[PDB]
Amino acid sequence: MDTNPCEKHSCIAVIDAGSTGSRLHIYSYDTDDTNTPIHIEEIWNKKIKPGFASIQPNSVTIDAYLTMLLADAPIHNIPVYFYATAGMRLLPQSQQKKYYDELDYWFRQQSQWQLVEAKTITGNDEALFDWLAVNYKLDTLKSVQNKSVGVMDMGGASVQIVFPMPKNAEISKHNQVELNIYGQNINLYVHSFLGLGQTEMSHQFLNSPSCFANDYPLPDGESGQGNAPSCKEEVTSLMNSVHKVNQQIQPLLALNPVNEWYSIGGISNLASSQLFHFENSELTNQSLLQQGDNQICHQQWDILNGQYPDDEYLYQYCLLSSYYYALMVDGYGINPNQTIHYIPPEQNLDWTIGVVLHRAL
Amino acid sequence: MDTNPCEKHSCIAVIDAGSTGSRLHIYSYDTDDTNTPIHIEEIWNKKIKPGFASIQPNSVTIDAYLTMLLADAPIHNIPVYFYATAGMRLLPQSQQKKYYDELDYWFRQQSQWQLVEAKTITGNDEALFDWLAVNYKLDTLKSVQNKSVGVMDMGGASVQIVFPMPKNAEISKHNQVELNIYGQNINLYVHSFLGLGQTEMSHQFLNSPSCFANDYPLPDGESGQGNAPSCKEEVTSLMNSVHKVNQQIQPLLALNPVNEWYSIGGISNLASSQLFHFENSELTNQSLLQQGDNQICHQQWDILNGQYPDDEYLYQYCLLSSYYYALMVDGYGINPNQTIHYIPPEQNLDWTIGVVLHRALE
Hints:
- The structure is a homodimer.
- Chain A is of the alpha/beta class and 361 residues long.
- The first copy, chain A, has helices at 59-70, 86-89, 93-108, 123-138, 198-202, 228-242, 245-255, 266-271, 285-297, 301-307, 317-331, 352-358; strands at residues 10-17, 22-31, 37-48, 79-84, 114-120, 149-154, 158-164, 176-181, 184-194, 260-265, 282-283, 340-342.
- Chain B: Mg(2+) 1 binds at residue 6.
- Chain B: One of its GO terms (cellular component) is membrane.
């Protein structure tokens, strides 16, 4: 990396304003003969909490939040994309508008950042960016691939799934995108399920004893009595009886098999706990469920809590192990012995590189 | 009301720290021969937003919040009960503790309020308070009733149901409460659900076309196509296939019928809104679902939104009417033609009178 990279390369700021927080990235890049970005490098990264949709939509609060997010960035005279996702999607447009009107005013009132867009993106655009970010990192975009790469983004309020699929006139146009990039034409199926991200879905199960370690104090005063297969069947009812995940996804995956699954988001954080034993930054659903059942669901909460003092979300690990299996195996139809790659959690990889690659007409 | 009522009567402050805001009440009362409150009178009420569990738990933020709640009260130098409910129950104890450590510090740092308790109450405790608050207002506590009174509290972040039921060795102790009030013994079944509060529930159905007016812009990019019976059937899957409300509740109401149903919380706001029409502060589930279907679900969103613009809640009324029906009829088993009384929303009635009457918890 150069010293003062934005004096030597194009630069853009992309903010991922998700349900749990907002993450600013500044990327430097060069461009190829078609003015498409190459050599994308992250030169700055800053996350603040809580989610933008969780703060009071008044000037003082929104102005303090943007200042906290942006003021200490090393370069400011660059284009900014502020893209909010599932936290903002939980709100009606009239409520979202209060946030964007105040944010727009804050950018208009300063003279360095160059706001391009500030908006709630759809889950479908977000899934496209999920797939572009991962495949950019895997270096599979420049040449036509012989294997199909699927991507899952496991967020706090939505989950996305995205994989190659030829155009299909029986499927909504909203769930398909024809990507042109580096001279190749890519057709993807995209889907986002709102309410199935980990925070939203956990709020359906907090008094389920099967979903928590033995003797964990549940909110209404009963005790955990963990059992991952039982917990998983409860979560599967939300996936398939309420949201119809398997009816929508499985027939398409059977017709368009994915050779390599990659995930970003929450799986990385769970699977990296010392409670688990994985190698090569990959897991299978059967191993995740078995290890969460043995190591967490069937262990005593006070012992776990004292033994893993730096696992902030330890109390949900039995639930999360069970939920990931419900979503991937019972929802998407992925075999429980299929390898799922997870991007190493130190990378904090999100969908933002997708915006660098896709934003131009 | 007296000039300073707390000079001649006992007064306490009760704060309902709920999901969308915190509401301070100051009550004056006298006590009867057993030191049980009578003549309870609300002498001050103030609601602030947002919910306590939504603010960042640091000293600057919590001082601004508690100042806004309490500093302009016309009376102070009284005991305070700060009881938080579902918004805080959605956080683990380790995270709640930061809030109460900061709140405890703020109270220690001042002189005007005497903090007695600041804690998250269970939904079972909240249900008992719901029942006591309504029955105190109905005057049914002092004497043995010929009728069974049931209460539902339709909250933002949980729902409660509570009704008389003799002590039952087969049911969890956590779902049964016994209390002696005005020298009478009262036994109640209590239950609360978080996943079924209005916020949590709604976050599972925002992409369901049946639950919004025609052409409403769903967040997934599809269009509303409202149909309240179909929306109700979708919400019933969360009630029964996920939460097993019917299996838990219906057998108990079959054995312990409720003669009069009262509700507090969101039903009152919906039913009193400009879009619905009910007489005598009561409704039937039949009529609620039909009104929502015709007055919201089957309308064109753009046109309806422009007709009723002072209305930021309207977008959700097809979903809410269908959800209330799914909860009451398909969950609890209530007959669609049974009267459900709702407390006039002008009263803003919450469960806090129950704390005046009952200082213990689970």
